[PDB]
Amino acid sequence: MLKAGVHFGHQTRYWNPKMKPFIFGARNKVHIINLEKTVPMFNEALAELNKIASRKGKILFVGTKRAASEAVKDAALSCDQFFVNHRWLGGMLTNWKTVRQSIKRLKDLETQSQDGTFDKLTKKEALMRTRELEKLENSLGGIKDMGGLPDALFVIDADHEHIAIKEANNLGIPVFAIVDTNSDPDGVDFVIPGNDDAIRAVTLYLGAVAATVREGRS
Amino acid sequence: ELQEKLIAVNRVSKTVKGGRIFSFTALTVVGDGNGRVGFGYGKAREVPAAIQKAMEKARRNMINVALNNGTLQHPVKGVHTGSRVFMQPASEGTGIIAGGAMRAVLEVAGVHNVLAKAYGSTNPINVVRATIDGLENMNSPEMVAAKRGK
Amino acid sequence: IKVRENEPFDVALRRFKRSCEKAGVLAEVRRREFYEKPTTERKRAKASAVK
RNA sequence: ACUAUGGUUUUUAUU
RNA sequence: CUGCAUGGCUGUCGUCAGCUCGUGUUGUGAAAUGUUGGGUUAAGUCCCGCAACGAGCGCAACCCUUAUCCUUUGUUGCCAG
RNA sequence: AGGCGGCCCCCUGGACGAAGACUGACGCUCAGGUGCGAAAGCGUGGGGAGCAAACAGGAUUAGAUACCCUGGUAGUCCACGCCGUAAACGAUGUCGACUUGGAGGUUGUGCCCUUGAGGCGUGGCUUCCGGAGCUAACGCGUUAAGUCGACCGCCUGGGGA
């Protein structure tokens, strides 16, 4: 990859002192990453993701916030991937042996929807199962055929989903995170410095893995 | 073949309307008899099922130990909160020694030659966390051959 | 203390009380408070658009 | 309006 | 004669809305969570939401009874022609 | 340290600064010594408006030598001495160096049209949060209970003391 996405920095400090190796000279206290410390660095990690895709490892895409909550389930869907757009239901990795009962619920409500088992002129009972199904779609709809756990996790904001990153560290699961200047990398296993909101950054690595889960191999 | 050992089990109670209810909290170890060891802690009703509940973790947790001529290459500390244990090697003969929680960890790894002392809290559920911190603190097993000269 | 303003009449309305600073409506105080809320709610989350 | 004081003793808990 | 020996029987909080079984997480651990919060109900109600999510016992339902129309059927009941 | 407070003009120790100069380890702590008081008290005489132990009464209560109310002496104040004790608390013994951060003040000094609601440097201070570190857990956090060193006192279960 090479340059583009020209930006001027946003917010001040609003920072983590761990980020010294990634930041440029600040003007008017407004802080920015250095393009020469970040673009070659995430291009060097784009190959690490392509190797997991060449081993057919199942990748989970997490984007629970406004800049990525549509793109997480469209920007790479032409290459088939698993996604979370708002919520996990919770304990999704360490309590999966229980949380699978809501995947069993989604399977039952879909085998009912697919045949019209509740489609009647008795509307309140039809809406009862419609609302419960369309509520499960929003948390489990992007992971219902993942057949087990992920082999890698990709997350848009490590300050927001830190409880599931704590699960991933306990289970030995790789974590790729586009950490912002005001985030923290200690729970992250593949650091690829970026942003969580505003610009011209939050869907940048997402727009690049959309080919490296198809090219290879893959 | 792998080996299983109990350290301790203790009664734990909750006071309620019309009396009291109780469970057991157990502490166990699992080892290979040659240099791998792990520990389990857990709480359930009945001693054998509290031991089974502690073994849930001992079937996952393990440390592989760095050794040189059947014993330790160096003296080392192990730390967790108020537990501040110390380990040092012994010669071929007597060498085990140590209290019921530290002795169990040395037994199941075949490391029957270490003068282990607690030098802090002896509390079984915390001196175990300090013991396995010391087994993680061990430096690599051929280090004298790397460290010679420059 | 001010209030030297010459109105021969008591007014059947609130004009300076219970709504601006030292409670109610603004600068609320006690009546049960929450301490995990400031470390739980940071950014919206709703209002764009509910409708 | 306000509204004094309380004699002695008190579970088996196993592997 | 003893519920200071008990199996059973039983009063009652109370129709009060609350309680268990498990798995996860946090905490040195007892313990916490969820069962806390925001509306709102007779009600964990009916939705929303947080590191807590399933399966049970309650709540709610099942079964019984009634206001008006239509139908089936009438003596030892009824009586408009 | 205790603490220090209307203003005005004085007497006066300490601290901080810029350019120079003169010393050349003069740096730290300290057994026993030798010295500071908030308030109340004393030794001796003055001064005496609030206020106020005691004293003197009332109320309340079955009782009230207390609460509460009504009067009120020592005392509070000034000189020359004594008392040496406190949450003297930031529950943090004392000297230096080393250290990723956020937010807010106080005061020198160097260069700039201060053509800047000052700015970028350089010195001395000072407050609320917060990450590494510490720890039984609470608490401490660059002004640390951290880190590495130097020194002086005391403690070893409580009652009894």
Q: Which residues touch strand E (CB under 7 A)?
A: A 87, 89-91, 94-95, 97-99, 101-102, 105, 128, 131, 135, 163, 166-167, 170; B 12, 14, 25, 41, 43-45, 53, 56, 81-82, 123, 125-126; C 32, 34, 40
What does the radius of gyration of chain B's CA atoms come to, in whole angstroms?
17
Q: Are strands B36-44 and B19-31 parallel, antiparallel or unpaired?
A: antiparallel
Query: What is the token pair recorded at A91?
Result: 């304990």
Burial tier of A112 (Cβ tally within 10 Å: 0-12, 13-18, 19+)? middle
Q: Containing H/E element for B78?
A: strand B76-80
Answer whether the bond into residue C24 is a cis peptide, omega within 30°: yes
Q: Show the DSSP H helices in A76-216 as ranges.
A: 96-113, 123-140, 162-171, 206-212
Are residues A67 and A202 in contact, defined by beta-carbon separation less than 8 angstroms? yes
Determine the protein residue whose CA lies at the shortest distance from the C1' of E31: B14
In angstroms, the CA B11 to CA B34 distance is: 33
Helix axes A123-140, A96-113, angle to 10 degrees: 140
Q: CB count, 10 Å around CB of A150? A: 22
B20 CB less than 7 Å from any atom of strand D: yes
A20 CB less than 7 Å from any atom of strand F: yes
In angstroms, the CA B53 to CA B79 distance is: 25
End-to-end CA distance of chain C: 46
Residues 6+ apart with CB under 8 A from C49: none
Q: CB count, 10 Å around CB of B11? A: 10
In angstroms, the CA A41 to CA A1 distance is: 10
In angstroms, the CA A176 to CA B19 distance is: 53
Are residues A150 and A60 in contact, defined by beta-carbon separation less than 8 angstroms? yes
Q: Show the DSSP H helices in chain A as ranges.
A: 35-54, 96-113, 123-140, 162-171, 206-212
CA distances from C37 to A90, A182, B139, C33 (A): 19, 21, 46, 9
Q: What are phi and psi of A177, to 5 degrees?
A: -140, 130
- Distance in angstroms, CA of B122 to C1' of F156? 21
Q: What are phi and psi of A87, to 5 degrees?
A: -145, 155
In angstroms, the CA A118 to CA A59 distance is: 35
Residues 102-141 of B with CB under 7 A from strand D: none
Are residues B95 and B110 in contact, defined by beta-carbon separation less than 8 angstroms? no
Residues in chain C: 51
In angstroms, the CA A36 to CA B90 distance is: 55
In angstroms, the CA A201 to CA B3 distance is: 54
Q: What are phi and psi of A155, to 5 degrees?
A: -125, 135
CA distances from C51 to A135, B85, C41, C46 (A): 19, 62, 20, 9
Rounded-to-10 torsion of CA B53, B59, B64, B67? 70
Say which nucleotide is closest to residue A132, CA to C1' distance. E47
Match 């004298």 to its residue by tokens.
B144
Match 């490391």 to its residue by tokens.
B111
Residues 6+ apart with CB under 8 A from B21: B13, B14
Residue B7, Ramachandran bin (φ over 0: left; ψ between -120 and 50: alpha; else beta):
alpha
Give the DSSP letter of residue A155: E
In angstroms, the CA B114 to CA B70 distance is: 10
For B11, how many CA atoms within 13 A lie in the half-sphere containing its CB?
A: 5
Are residues A195 and A155 in contact, defined by beta-carbon separation less than 8 angstroms? no
* 3-state secondary structure at position A98: helix
CA B26 remoteness from chain centre: 14
Q: Containing H/E element for A154?
A: strand A152-155
Query: What is the token pair recorded at A126?
Result: 């039809």
Among A35, A136, A154, A158, CA closest to A88: A136
Residues 6+ apart with CB under 8 A from B7: B27, B28, B29, B100, B101, B104, B124, B128
Are residues A173 and A150 in contact, defined by beta-carbon separation less than 8 angstroms? yes
Query: What is the token pair recorded at B93?
Result: 């003969």
Subunits adjacent to chain A (3 or more Cβ pairs under 8 Å) = none
Subunits adjacent to chain C (3 or more Cβ pairs under 8 Å) = none
In angstroms, the CA A160 to CA A181 distance is: 14
B70 CB less than 7 Å from any atom of strand F: no
Helix axes B100-107, B124-137, angle to 10 degrees: 40
Experimental technique, in short, is: cryo-EM
In angstroms, the CA B135 to CA B121 distance is: 18
Q: What are phi and psi of B88, to 5 degrees?
A: -150, 145
B2 CB less than 7 Å from any atom of strand D: no
Say which nucleotide is closest to residue B81, CA to C1' distance. E28
Question: In this structure, is the dihedral angle defined by the CA atoms of residues B109, B115, B121 and B122, taken in order, positive or negative?
Answer: positive
Residues 6+ apart with CB under 8 A from A216: A50, A53, A54
- Strand F positions within 7 A of protein Cβ atoms: 100-103, 132, 135-137
Say which nucleotide is closest to residue B20, CA to C1' distance. D11
Name B114's bridge partners: B89
- Strand E positions within 7 A of protein Cβ atoms: 22-26, 28-31, 37-38, 47-48, 50-55
A15 CB less than 7 Å from any atom of strand F: yes
Among B49, B60, B51, B5, CA closest to B26: B51
A116 CB less than 7 Å from any atom of strand F: no
